[PDB]
Design a binder for this molecule. Structure first.
Ligand SMILES: [Ca+2]
Ligand SMILES: [Ca+2]
Ligand SMILES: [Ca+2]
Ligand SMILES: [Ca+2]
Ligand SMILES: [Ca+2]
Ligand SMILES: [Ca+2]
Ligand SMILES: [Ca+2]
Ligand SMILES: [Ca+2]
Ligand SMILES: [Ca+2]
Ligand SMILES: [Ca+2]
Ligand SMILES: [Ca+2]
Ligand SMILES: [Ca+2]
Ligand SMILES: [Ca+2]
Ligand SMILES: [Ca+2]
Ligand SMILES: [Ca+2]
Ligand SMILES: [Ca+2]
Lengths: 195, 195, 195, 195
């Protein structure tokens, strides 16, 4: 009742005829999904760039917060790797990566009310919450087109990780608020550095 | 087409204004979900307590089944850790843990028909099947409110583990039924002990 | 508000009364799901057998492609293990394994247009794409009956792996097409062998 | 004849009065130089992005050149690190990093005349020669304003490295031209991969 060689005729002729310009791998991988992944690639790639700008801010000699600087360089590396994993899945499924423009990020993060430390961490948290929702939207599209493979990929990977990321950033914010400017920031900068 | 600093304004003002009495992390985390997790926390916590009672029963000198006793102490530790993981996710997502009352468990497990061993294992199995359904219900709520992160968390963790747990308990029951009272129980108590 | 010993009465009487002819473990595990797993078992088992036939083809002294032969023996072992994992889940959930007939596979793979190497790899790819869809269908049934445990099992395991498998086979095809017959096939046979 | 405490009065009052909004480190570091470094940062950052696009192209299942893909991912990491070193020098000297927009890179690299391999390597070489001149221009500005520290930094670092890079890319091009399409590309893809 299972005749593999009759059943595979469809796929077989598809494969044997395909031009070298077509992905051979693509199976039930919707254009909208393909496009949503490119979108999310661009989102991670943008956030990586923003994080890199934050790094340069804390690297400034008069800011003197090299722990925060290290933290942001790493966050930048990490977000760029998030983009890379998405690209990897894209070509894994037969989709094609489209890389989009990156806008110039903000470079200035002085803030008299909150202090640049706390402000930057509040900005970061806010960005992470935003990306959590972006990730949620990405799986929604995946779910819409009933691509269970892509759902599993998104939710077990980035989505799940983003949860941890958000909580971690919430705590930093809570800490900066608790200890206040001056010594508190210096201490937290020390902590952020050994990580 | 992606302007992070315009797009983050919503999240940013939310974060910057929040009082220290609000979770900073909570994002699309429904009260009903938050409440269902507390419920399931209480269910694991209750089952841990019941398992602890079973342990004390088999610890009684005249019962003389220290392997079963060890087995139940471990099951009790394990269920309490299940509760702990749920609590961890709760505060991870910005939800708040509510711990509920624990009813006094049954302490007596003598049974003339089946023997206390077999009976206890049938009770345990029954409890595990029950909890499998509770877990199923927990993900249903998660699914209802389209919280893919929580679904992934529930199904890849406890739900999936509960499947293994149920099968493992089914086998014990099958074994006790096979070997019958006396030597069979003593042998299985030995097995349960080295685990 | 949680009385475990009242709530477990249903499950308890079910368990205590069950005959030794009934699975004790089965919980909300639909017959259609049980049957779909048997189907997918048969599909992996068939593909394993086909792969074994491919192996014997490349083992022929006049074909002289022992790397391709090794590759197919391994693919055959691997697909049979896929069947075994499905069987394992089946009895894990209380379902019963039904093993179905295996049709005689094709033994001949000479092909003048493409060459047997490329042809076999195109056949393999086609089979893998086919199985990707079969796997997709399997989770659809799981999803239909709202068995989140089985969904998680299917998508995190075989489904997700099948994605990698398809891409890997696409690349082989691309390579054979690139290097053409003769030395190209000999080189790829060498590569396939050290894997 | 050297009275440090009289001679340092200038620098001392400068330092003691400076607001926390000024770099404390900046010394004879011309705006034009500061701006040229930002420019060159953007150039490395752009080339990193382009290299990342090349990577995704060779990652496509139907292209099947994972060695070239690896090569470009690494080149992309490396160029981004070049940007990072420039940023590091910028804040080292008291200058401020300005990150600029990144244009969408080309994603398509099929080429019927030369083959995508050779074409991509010719593109890469061309890009590297271009960047060699950009680097030359960067030191010219440094030289113009007689900033010997920045000259030394530029010429001993990136400039000197870019020389090696250009020669290395010339050789790849020479090799692809020598071996031609098919097996030659497959062999070179193997070489590019183990690097
Ligand atoms: Ca999943
Ligand atoms: Ca799923
Ligand atoms: Ca997963
Ligand atoms: Ca992310
Ligand atoms: Ca999942
Ligand atoms: Ca899910
Ligand atoms: Ca998971
Ligand atoms: Ca549990
Ligand atoms: Ca899942
Ligand atoms: Ca699921
Ligand atoms: Ca999983
Ligand atoms: Ca499979
Ligand atoms: Ca010098
Ligand atoms: Ca010099
Ligand atoms: Ca030097
Ligand atoms: Ca360079």
């Amino acid at each position: 009742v299972f005749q593999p060689f009759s059943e595979v005729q469809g796929e077989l002729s598809t494969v044997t005829q395909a031009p070298v310009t077509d992905s051979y791998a693509r199976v039930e991988y919707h254009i909208e999904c393909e496009a949503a992944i490119n979108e999310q690639i661009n989102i991670e790639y943008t956030i990586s760039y923003v994080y890199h700008a934050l790094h340069s801010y804390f690297a400034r000699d008069n800011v003197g917060l090299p722990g925060f600087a290290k933290f942001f360089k790493e966050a930048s590396d990490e977000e760029r790797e998030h983009a890379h994993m998405l690209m990897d899945y894209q070509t894994k499924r037969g989709g094609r990566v489209e890389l989009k423009p990156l806008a110039a990020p903000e470079m200035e993060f002085a803030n008299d009310d909150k202090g640049e430390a706390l402000y930057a961490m509040e900005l970061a948290l806010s960005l992470e919450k935003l990306n959590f929702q972006k990730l949620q939207a990405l799986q929604a599209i995946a779910d819409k087109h009933k691509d269970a493979a892509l759902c599993d990929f998104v939710e077990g990977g980035l989505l799940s990780e983003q949860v941890d990321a958000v909580k971690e950033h919430a705590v930093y914010v809570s800490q900066l608020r608790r200890v206040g400017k001056g010594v508190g920031v210096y201490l937290l900068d020390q902590e952020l550095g050994e990580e």
